[PDB]
């Protein structure tokens, strides 16, 4: 955890931010310490100023704890959990009509059996 956080903090303005921190391998170790998916964690690039983002040294890990447990309550993606936020504010209707159907299909994929 220390070697990961020390690497995340290296020289954002003078070097690493415009080089995307080498996102393809720095964001990999954040998945590896969790034994988790190095893929969908890259959705974090939807916030924090075009950084990876990773140098916010706790809150992203603290949230990913809850994303990992939610990802074991249900087989839904973090990509769809973002839409469940976007729909809050009297938002566009076709996204709600689609998200309801997508969650229904994600339940059929488990059914009265167990499956995945």
């Amino acid at each position: 955890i220390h070697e990961y956080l020390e690497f995340a903090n290296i020289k954002k303005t003078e070097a690493e931010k415009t080089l995307v921190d080498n996102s393809e391998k720095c964001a990999e170790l954040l998945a590896e310490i969790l034994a988790w998916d190095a893929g969908e964690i890259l959705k974090a690039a939807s916030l924090l100023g075009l950084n990876p983002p990773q140098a916010t040294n706790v809150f992203e890990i603290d949230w990913i704890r809850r994303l990992q447990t939610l990802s074991e309550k249900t087989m839904i993606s973090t990509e769809y959990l973002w839409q469940m936020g976007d729909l809050t504010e009297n938002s566009e209707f076709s996204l709600k009509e689609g998200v309801g159907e997508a969650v229904m299909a994600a339940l059929k994929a488990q059914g009265d059996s167990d499956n995945v």
């Binding site: 070697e3 020390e6 690497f7 391998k25 720095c26 990999e28 170790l29």
Partner: protein, 233 residues
Amino acid sequence: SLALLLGVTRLAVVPTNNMVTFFKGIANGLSENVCLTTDDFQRQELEGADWWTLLSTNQVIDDMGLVLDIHPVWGKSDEEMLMEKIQSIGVSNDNNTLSIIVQILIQAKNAQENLLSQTISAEYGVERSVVPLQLRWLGSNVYSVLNQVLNNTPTDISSIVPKLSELTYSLLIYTQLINSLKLNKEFIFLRLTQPNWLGLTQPKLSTQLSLPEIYLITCYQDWVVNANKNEDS
């Protein structure tokens, strides 16, 4: 795990400056009173090295001739091969002046090996009897690692040679090859000595590994336990 061990879709790692603290630790351990004879160690005409200048009343010829280094072989390696190699290279003075400079050299060879076998055992969790065999079977040499001190590896720039930075990465995968299954050094010693004699094909003198070995060495590692008599028969 098997795909990683077979080298398909390989791992990623960060060159943290802690690695320099480790290699500077090796350089420090080499420098603090070990006083090692590694000063241009192998290559022919070994001239200008301190140790035999002091002992010159007993023997002068510090330059010797051909090289002072060893490759392992089964049944019996040891200082008898190091003696026979230096005895073969045209010394006509077969008296005690030749044998005394072998018993002066044995502890000086130990002082090159004992550094790695005692230190890296505390980094990676392997017994000191496995370390030099693991190092060669990975595709390395004890002096080639120690020469990286002379290549300025102890300098705390955030860059080091691939010969260390990818070797260190490769050591972890070969550590899982000796912990996801456990086996004894005599197997490694045979495998490293004589691949075709063990039963492999000539290309497997290289560092590369594939499933036709992994089946046979695993089914051997079962059969050596399953057999009705102890280890050595």
